[PDB]
From a paper:
SA lipase (SAL, also known as glycerol ester hydrolase), a triacylglycerol esterase, shows strong cytopathic activity in host cells. SAL, an ester bond-hydrolyzing enzyme, is secreted in prepolypeptide form containing 690 amino acid residues and is processed into its mature form containing 394 amino acid residues. Its active site is composed of a typical catalytic triad including Ser116, Asp 307, and His349 residues, similar to other serine hydrolases. The SAL crystal structure exhibited a typical α/β-hydrolase fold comprising a central twisted β-sheet flanked by α-helices on both sides.
We screened various chemical libraries and discovered that the anti-obesity drug orlistat is a potent SAL inhibitor with an IC50 value of 2.4 μM. The crystal structure of the SAL–orlistat complex showed an inhibitor-binding site and atomic-level details of binding interactions. Notably, the β-lactone rings of orlistat molecules were decyclized by their hydrolyzing ring cleavage reaction with SAL on chains A and B. Ser116 attached the carbonyl carbon atom of the orlistat tetracyclic rings at the active sites. Then, orlistat covalently bound to Ser116, with the oxygen atom of Ser116 and orlistat maintaining the bond. SAL monomer bound one orlistat molecule each in a similar manner. The oxygen atom of the hydroxy group is hydrogen bound to the His349 side-chain nitrogen atom (2.67 Å). The Ser116 side-chain residue covalently bound to the carboxylate group and shared one oxygen atom with both SAL and orlistat. The other oxygen of the decycled carboxylate group formed hydrogen bonds with two nitrogen atoms of the main chain Phe17 (2.97 Å) and Met117 (2.75 Å), which form the oxyanion hole. The terminal N-formyl carbonyl group of the amino ester moiety was located in the hydrophobic pocket formed by Leu18, Tyr29, Pro30, Tyr32, Val350, Ile353, and Val355. The α-side chain of orlistat was also primarily bound to a hydrophobic pocket, which was formed by Ala174, Ala176, Pro168, Leu242, Val309, Val310, and partially Phe17 at the bottom of its deep active site. The SAL–orlistat complex also had an open form, with the lid region located as far as possible from the catalytic cavity.
Numbering used by the authors:
A (entry chain A), B (entry chain B): 4 to 385
The structure:
Amino acid sequence: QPLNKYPVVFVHGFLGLVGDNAPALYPNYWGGNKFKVIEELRKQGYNVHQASVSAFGSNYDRAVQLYYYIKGGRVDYGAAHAAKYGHERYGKTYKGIMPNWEPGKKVHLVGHSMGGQTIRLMEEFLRNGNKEEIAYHQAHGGEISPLFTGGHNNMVASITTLATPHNGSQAADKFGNTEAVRKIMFALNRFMGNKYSNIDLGLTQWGFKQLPNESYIDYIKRVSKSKIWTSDDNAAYDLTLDGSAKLNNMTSMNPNITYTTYTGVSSHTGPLGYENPDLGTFFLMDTTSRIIGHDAREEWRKNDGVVPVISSLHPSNQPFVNVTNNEPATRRGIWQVKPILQGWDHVDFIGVDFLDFKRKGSELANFYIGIINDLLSVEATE
Amino acid sequence: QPLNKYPVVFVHGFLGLVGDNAPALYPNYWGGNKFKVIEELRKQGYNVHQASVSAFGSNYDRAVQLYYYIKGGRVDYGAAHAAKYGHERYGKTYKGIMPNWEPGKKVHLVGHSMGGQTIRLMEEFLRNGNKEEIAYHQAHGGEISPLFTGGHNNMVASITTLATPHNGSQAADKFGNTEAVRKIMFALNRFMGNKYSNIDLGLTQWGFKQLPNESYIDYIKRVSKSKIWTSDDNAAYDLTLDGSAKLNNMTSMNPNITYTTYTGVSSHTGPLGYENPDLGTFFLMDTTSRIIGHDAREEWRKNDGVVPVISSLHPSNQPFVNVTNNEPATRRGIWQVKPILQGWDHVDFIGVDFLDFKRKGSELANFYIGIINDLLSVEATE
Ligand SMILES: *OC(=O)[C@@H](CCCCCC)[C@@H](O)C[C@H](CCCCCCCCCCC)OC(=O)[C@H](CC(C)C)NC=O
Ligand SMILES: CCCCCCCCCCC[C@@H](C[C@H](O)[C@H](CCCCCC)C(=O)O)OC(=O)[C@H](CC(C)C)NC=O
Ligand SMILES: CCCCCCCCCCCCCCCCCC(=O)O
Ligand SMILES: CCCCCCCCCCCC(=O)O
Ligand SMILES: CCCCCCCCCCCC(=O)O
Ligand SMILES: CCCCCCCCCCCC(=O)O
Ligand SMILES: CCCCCCCCCCCC(=O)O
Ligand SMILES: [Ca+2]
Ligand SMILES: [Ca+2]
């Protein structure tokens, strides 16, 4: 029946909220009003889905949630990890988009921003398990999620990344992960965990859910004891250069998977060597773009508003090949780097810059159909 | 002591709120965060003021209100006018900015958007009175406001208008005047009249103020009977082509007043001869710009986003002369039409397009100093 033999799962980045979990007024993540990715691709005959995973959590908490979003079941972050970071072992429970997901039945994974990192960690868990959980289950018995055991291959056909900070972003190191902004973020999470909230921001495993009989005052008091306030097991840390390099160091190439990256630039060179945002960079990124563009190291400057080009092209020290837009993108085991999209800021990729009339719906539609054609090539040349 | 002999009064347009009356988060009307008109001109030794008048009311209502803002006193709309339109005769009471304003002690008047029309009407009342109120006062005794008496001359030095729709705007005829949109506007005025509201949107003469012991239900019932819902005594009607033509058909040139106008363009010709908004036109004006720009009469197309050029230049039936940027703007009795400001949209005049990096503070600084230097000239040459 569907044109693609393997389902496509789109994975959102940091601050992303999709589907039922989006606030009452909030942009449609995959395509804004420009090209409604999920709905239009379904209409054309493709089987596509929009994953929903923590908007503020770590790559690790998100990757476990992605496994359960696809497979179904109750999220198990692992006993060793829960105990090490001081959050709940068990999280939400998902119905599962493909409850029969197993070696043989594969999925295509497409990630935007942080979603690109989360996809890689999940593949890493399927193939290799999680050593600390294996050791923990060895020493203490109990149950271990099959996500953590390793040995599970032929489950992912492809990994495609769009403006992913594979090597981190200075917009995290210098704002985002600063004390003052982590506090803003975490206050927002506490608020949206109140007894009348229908929207889950992705940190309830740290205690941010007010109980039905608990006053707000007591809730503030309970949740100020949470480890979240000083932990690294969160997105803001993960997106920093250190945080993303930890992830690069624990991943490896799968020789069966087709890897491919897209990257945009939306900065231009100032007469001093520094990069400044183009007119029509989504305006919420004027400051983050300047921070990146004024880096001491010249090759870290060119950026999309919030991720530097060097971070998006591919994980550093992982094999890659610059590829053209024409040729098939059909090589396995190697990051295929697509030519830089000129004038595309971070959010032009998902269509939510409603202020920018140069980036047209017809264009974004061609962009996503181009990905889908590549994914169909991957299937045809298996 | 102040460098200008006559005080300069700036008059906001439709939807404008200023000072104490501005909502909690709301732009600083006179210069945004670009150039703080009032505070900076004061700092440079000029005596300037921003009038606070009705944001949604008619030119008539607003002109009466302007008179009291300057003079001090209890707003009197006139008994004939209150009885013909169906609203309160009396309104707000103003402390007065020049309590001794009389023939001999002039004021300079500058108006943005509808401000410019309001200013023309107030001066018509000062000079020639309101004949309807005279004949009401003939018939029934009681009091007549001096604003309606007539023969007050030599009270305003100058009328200068920025992006004022002297001949209306189709954005009113099509948008901002229609039934469905009048309802939205009146709805909001109803709500801002609630008994916890500290902000006055300027239609409380029509019944829009909740009593302290009146429930919101009874308020709705009561104000439902107001004539506001079907009247023309309102801004939306007055900004239409017929609305503004009516004001033109009853104003005339005072030959001792110095008249000058300014006009912005922020549209460009498309391949069919229609006008579309430039990149940079404040985005809340995209649709209104297209409505104007697609007019069937070619001369009505070029626009600043919300007012067509042919409307801003001069009242169509009054005398004018195209003036250069450098000629001292010193002629009495004739609309001196300043050259069009290329790339300036409707709101770049007051500096609030925080999204347009091409329109800088220092540009807006020179523009306003420009206006003051021309007012100084008016003084210097009596
Ligand atoms: O996952 C990501 O790709 C992430 C890239 C890393 C950048 C780290 C920055 C901390 C990125 O998308 C994050 C970006 C953040 C936008 C910053 C907002 C700052 C407000 C400042 C106030 C204005 C005056 C200075 O997130 C988005 O673009 C976001 C989600 C993306 C995944 C698209 N938008 C949609 O919700
Ligand atoms: C930072 C936020 C800026 C908001 C600007 C949004 C403009 C939306 C369209 C509103 C129509 C325009 C209406 C025009 O001014 C109006 C022109 C006539 C237009 C008729 C169409 C209703 C006028 O000149 O008084 O209103 C605004 O731009 C207002 C105040 C205006 C006196 C400057 N903006 C609010 O301050
Ligand atoms: C116009 C009156 C609306 C007031 C109702 C709610 C009270 C809160 C006030 C703040 C909202 C003001 C809306 C105007 C938004 C523009 C402000 C901006 O440019 O940041
Ligand atoms: C009345 C429902 C309130 C919904 C919460 C607002 C969420 C803020 C996001 C604003 C961005 C936008 O939707 O344009
Ligand atoms: C439109 C954004 C409003 C931000 C107001 C600041 C309040 C911050 C503290 C929040 C803590 C909490 O409510 O749990
Ligand atoms: C336009 C602002 C967004 C909120 C929409 C509320 C619509 C309610 C209309 C009735 C106004 C009233 O409460 O008197
Ligand atoms: C978050 C704001 C999005 C605005 C999208 C552009 C379409 C708005 C149409 C005209 C706006 C108005 O004046 O009400
Ligand atoms: Ca953009
Ligand atoms: Ca502008």
